[PDB]
């Protein structure tokens, strides 16, 4: 494939986010920095914090140019603070181009950075809507558009337990098996899509879409878990605690509060069921459903144990797909178009009895009344 040079360029840790490599300013610097498909500042660590190995020295790049202009990005539980400017910025494995693009050199933060997890900054992914400090301040997609030939366009392979593939400018075919099914984006902010069914092992759990979008639904990569409004979490989890009845769980496991180890080797995967979202399709009253695996959302927290953890978490916010869901497949951002494409990844954990599913078509009747205003 033409793309070979960006396959694998994806690092990282269980649950701590998965890292691509960028340069910036001159003579180079190099930085992991995180891949968020759920925010859209570039920003960097740009001072000494106990969490990281390296830092961006603004001071010994002569491309780097202070805007004149603080930034402030609060977030659920942490926040960070920083300064505005702009440099060269270049992905060793991605794109052949380089781009003067905005950066926040962030100076002080609160449980931002985590400890161990090798990445010193975020690369917000998604539209100037919810940039910080304002829609003005365009994003580093924009920016790569707007200066290059590069297709607008990228697609994410995260493969869990880590690794992945980040490509910038098309589709990698060697990434993924079947065909790739695209959802509309609804709106321009987040990548904001449409749920219109939720199933656990075949069963539907009938409620009103309305409440599957409750807010929104996004999908979203620098997030671990599938976090689900509140009433559709609490349905989910009787169906999920029905499906697995053969077995019993202390009810603080359901809520990510307690881990449940096995003794390694002996985890029976078999006894949870699948969970299948049905997203709208590009055509009236049609719809697909991509299918995830207990490999997905129990993730292994790192003996002779293997312990896990649910990975499906309530939400006041909307539905968010986080890594729980791309870890199965590879993912489309096919921003040219305004849609959002998913195809069983050619790396999802699987056993032999069961795979990550991406199927359709379905008909699901009166779609439209299921998004949030
Ligand atoms: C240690 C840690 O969690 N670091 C971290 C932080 Cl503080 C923020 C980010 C920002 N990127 C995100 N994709 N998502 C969030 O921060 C989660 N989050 C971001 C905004 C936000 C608002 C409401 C709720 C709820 N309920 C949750 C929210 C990434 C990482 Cl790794």
């Known amino acids: 494939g033409s793309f070979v040079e960006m396959v694998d360029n994806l690092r990282g840790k269980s649950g701590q986010g998965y890292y691509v490599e960028m340069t910036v300013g001159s003579p ?10 759920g925010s859209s500042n570039f920003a960097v660590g740009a ?27 609060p977030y659920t539980q942490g926040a960070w603070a920083g300064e505005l400017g702009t440099d060269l910025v270049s992905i060793p494995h991605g794109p052949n181009v380089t781009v003067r693009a905005n950066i926040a050199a962030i100076t002080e933060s ?44 990228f697609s994410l392979q995260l493969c869990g337990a880590v690794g992945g ?23 321009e902010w987040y ?35 599938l976090r689900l409004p509140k009433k559709v979490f609490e349905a989910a989890v009787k169906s999920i605690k029905a499906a697995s ?14 881990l449940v180890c096995w003794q390694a080797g002996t985890t029976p995967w078999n006894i949870f069921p699948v969970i299948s979202l049905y997203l709208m399709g590009e055509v009236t009253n ?7 695996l207990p490999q997905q959302y129990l993730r292994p927290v790192e003996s002779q144990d293997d312990c896990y953890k649910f990975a499906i978490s309530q939400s006041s916010t909307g539905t968010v797909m986080g890594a ?50």
């Open 28 to 37: 180079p610097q190099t930085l992991n920095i995180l891949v968020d498909t």
């Open 47 to 73: 001072a000494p914090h106990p969490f990281l190995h390296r830092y961006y020295q603004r001071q010994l790049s002569s491309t780097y140019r202070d805007l004149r202009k603080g930034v402030y990005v």
């Open 110 to 153: 609160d449980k931002f950075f985590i400890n161990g997890s090798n990445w010193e900054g975020i690369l917000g992914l998604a539209y100037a809507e919810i940039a910080r400090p304002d829609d003005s301040l365009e994003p580093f997609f924009d920016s790569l558009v707007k200066q290059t030939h590069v297709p607008n366009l």
């Open 165 to 187: 593939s980040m490509i910038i400018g098309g589709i990698d075919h060697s990434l993924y098996t079947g065909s790739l099914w695209y959802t509309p984006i609804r709106r």
């Open 191 to 225: 990548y904001e899509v449409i749920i219109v069914r939720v199933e656990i092992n075949g069963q539907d759990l009938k409620m009103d879409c309305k409440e599957y979008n409750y807010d929104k639904s996004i999908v979203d990569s620098g997030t671990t878990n």
């Open 245 to 258: 009845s053969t077995e019993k769980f202390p009810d603080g496991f359901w809520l990510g509060e307690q």
């Open 286 to 292: 049609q719809s697909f459903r991509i299918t995830i």
């Open 324 to 373: 729980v869901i791309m870890e199965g497949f590879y993912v489309v951002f096919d921003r040219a178009r305004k849609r959002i494409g998913f195809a069983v990844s050619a790396c999802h954990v699987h056993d032999e009895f069961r795979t990550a599913a991406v199927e359709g078509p379905f008909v699901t009747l009166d779609m439209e009344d299921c998004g949030y205003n």
